[PDB]
């Protein structure tokens, strides 16, 4: 071999140093998104058990008996009722003053700037189906005043990897269908199946 | 009066032969209670501490 | 190093890009097959409760009190009696005209081409055991005319991953034994244990 | 997870890092190709079935805004009768979807013309030609329909 | 990158292929052990009902009315009285010649080499408490001759996963305490609570 | 990469620079020898086993 071959060898190792391999942060974000699914299905289960025992759905996480373990990355909202969001910013959880409809993000181990004290998801791209005319307002609907309550509606809000913006999930007791968009999938969603209104792995910005 | 799992504090139940209504709180539910139905005044699953 | 080493590095990456890993679609199909087990055991339980209260088994899912949740992937048949199979092709379930002996696949969220409106399984490789001489016909046997009814027989039919063909399950109130075959296991089956007559993970085609 | 294949890269969860040199198409559905012509990626308006070449660091004249490869020399094998149209086939209407089909398009060194790749979920066989290899291709193995290292010009 | 990196990648996948993950057969054995708990509590309930109606405890499973469903994995002994153990080695259960004090393992669907025709558990590590001076001999004690019978004592015996040796349980009508050992837990046992004398998940061999 | 040797110079990826003085044959298979008789190299009709 000659000088040109050897310089080409050097240039090839330089090329491999700057190779453009797949973005695996997307894969790791998809890995992290499973907290939302598991915890929302736990919320569904607890709501069903509470209704069975009490003939009514609940607007608060205290009565349902649902709480995710620390390190959650996601803030969970059980209803739009008034109250604080159980801020998790210390080793010891605070003593509640009243029923809590929302559970904040665990900012103890993720930093103070990562806090989510109002974990209300986006529901623009979830369309309820059926003749019962259900809405997209979170919580027990049409009102908690009807003991044979129509199906509840809940959701979560979080951040996957270093996305400045959030990803949103919803779970409903009724059938609905998703809409196609820059940050969501199209297809019918069975009752009790989490749906990703904004996934944050596809998009980052004003996209919804 | 008892204790569920590793709660330092207790949960409380009552049963009455007369009608009553529960009050909303950090550790209790709101709604009317028929005579002969146990009511959980403090449930210990929702809260642990000074909460009642 | 020299040119040959560097081209060998490139070729090794080409090799790893085309490596032959295990087929994990089979593992996921085995994951999806658990609906059939859970729902068939629920069918068994509901049939036993119905007999206990009424001194007789039923050929209809209305009377038993059994219905899987939406998104089931499997059609269930409680009997061979006449009647429509509660087609699940819309958000609102249809109002029945009479007792339904079969529950169709949930084609609302799986597409219209995936519909299973006649979920009758294959029972060739299930051999009832015992002197009572039980048959493999689905439903209450020998007839619902005998209130101390001999044990029932029921099954399910579905599709796991992208198999064009189906996998079939059965559950019986009486003992039986499985036969070895291209798509089934050999061994004795206790009463109340689902048996996979055709699994659809081992095979796809005319194999039974 | 979903019992169906996708025609959009945003739902799949796939995106190559910057400096890719290759444009990728996951389907022939309608939509823009996520033009990578600036430091900050654009906000999509809808689902994107194609990812353009990263012309930010390779120049504006090197842009590939429609990375549809050549598929003349890939022959699907099997009785299922699969096609060479890119995307989910025969159509996304069948949730037990038949295998997808995808590809890429790029330029190696100073070739004026491009080189093309395909990856399928089904079996196929390559055809001998001026710019391709002959032999059977297993499912999930990339195949080089036009390699651009052997040829440059009208050759396919 | 260079050759060393690529060979290190190959070596790392080789490492992962031989990773030492937790032994999950122990978790599955713990899952399988629930038959013993449920069926022993059923024995306890049936014995209590029989006493209430008849003012005496029974030494036979026929009179009590207790029989586990097929596929039991465990043999149950209600007394040490003489008699056969209702061998479950065929689809049709045998017609009993006389009262049966024991129920054999269901070897119909577990194989002939897994038969347990004498399911007498180990009782070395169960110490009765109280001034009444109760014993560890299985059955109605001190004798069935006293109608205000002192509390009964029963147990089960089985095999979890591929342990060559067996695991043993006991349920008593009187208070007792466990003894710490290689295959048992230490702590007080309330009357009517099954206790695992040898668990077979912790140990396999001569350990008791 | 492919678990087989090639009969053609197209697939291997081998071509000497212009001014080579030597003709190279990688196989005896049928095909033309990539005649280098002009400034622009010809477009091949099929795999070439030899380089003129």
Curated annotation (Swiss-Prot), chain B:
Part of the full-length chain shown: 169 to 220 of 220
Observed phenotype of the null mutant: Deletion mutants show loss of observable pili.
Compartments, record wording: Fimbrium; Membrane
Top-level taxon of origin: Bacteria
Induction of synthesis: By the two-component system PilR/PilS component PilR. In the contrary, PilS is a negative regulator of pilA expression. In addition, an increased level of c-di-GMP correlates with reduced transcription of the pilA gene. Expression of pilA seems to be negatively regulated by the accumulation of pilin at a cell end.
Family, similarity comment: Belongs to the N-Me-Phe pilin family.
Function in brief: Major component of the type IV pili that are required for social gliding motility through cycles of extension and retraction. Extended pili are composed of thousands of copies of PilA and retract upon binding to extracellular polysaccharides and thereby pull the cell forward.
Protein name per Swiss-Prot or TrEMBL: Type IV major pilin protein PilA
Miscellaneous notes: Pilin assembly limits pilus production and S motility. This limitation could be linked to the high frequency of reversal of gliding direction observed in M.xanthus. Reversal implies loss of pili at the leading pole of the cell and commissioning of new pili assembly at the other pole.
Gene source species: Myxococcus xanthus (strain DK1622)
From Swiss-Prot, chain D:
Membrane topology: Single-pass membrane protein
UniProt keyword Transmembrane helix present: yes
Keywords associated with the record: Fimbrium, Membrane, Methylation, Transmembrane, Transmembrane helix
Disruption phenotype: Deletion mutants show loss of observable pili.
Additional remark text: Pilin assembly limits pilus production and S motility. This limitation could be linked to the high frequency of reversal of gliding direction observed in M.xanthus. Reversal implies loss of pili at the leading pole of the cell and commissioning of new pili assembly at the other pole.
Family, similarity comment: Belongs to the N-Me-Phe pilin family.
Protein name: Type IV major pilin protein PilA
Name of the encoding gene: pilA
Portion of the full-length sequence here: 65 to 220 of 220
């Amino acid at each position: 071999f000659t000088l040109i071959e050897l310089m080409i060898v050097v240039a090839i190792i330089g090329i491999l140093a700057a190779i453009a391999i797949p973005n695996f942060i997307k894969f790791q974000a998809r890995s992290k998104q499973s907290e939302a699914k598991t915890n929302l299905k736990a919320l569904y289960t607890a709501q069903k058990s509470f209704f069975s025992e009490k003939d009514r759905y609940s607007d608060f996480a205290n009565e349902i008996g649902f709480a995710p373990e620390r390190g959650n990355r996601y803030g969970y909202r059980v209803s739009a009722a008034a109250g604080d969001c159980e801020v998790r910013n210390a080793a010891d959880l605070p003593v509640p003053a009243a029923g809590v409809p929302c559970i904040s993000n665990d900012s103890f181990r993720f930093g103070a700037n990562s806090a989510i004290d109002d974990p209300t998801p986006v529901v623009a791209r979830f369309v309820p189906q059926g003749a019962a005319g259900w809405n997209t307002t979170l919580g027990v609907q049409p009102t908690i005043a009807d003991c044979p309550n129509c199906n509840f509606f809940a959701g979560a809000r979080g951040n996957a990897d270093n996305e400045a913006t959030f990803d949103d999930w919803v779970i409903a007791g009724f059938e609905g269908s998703g809409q196609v968009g820059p940050c969501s999938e199209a297809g019918n969603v069975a009752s009790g199946t989490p749906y990703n209104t904004r996934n944050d792995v596809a998009c980052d910005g004003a996209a919804q």
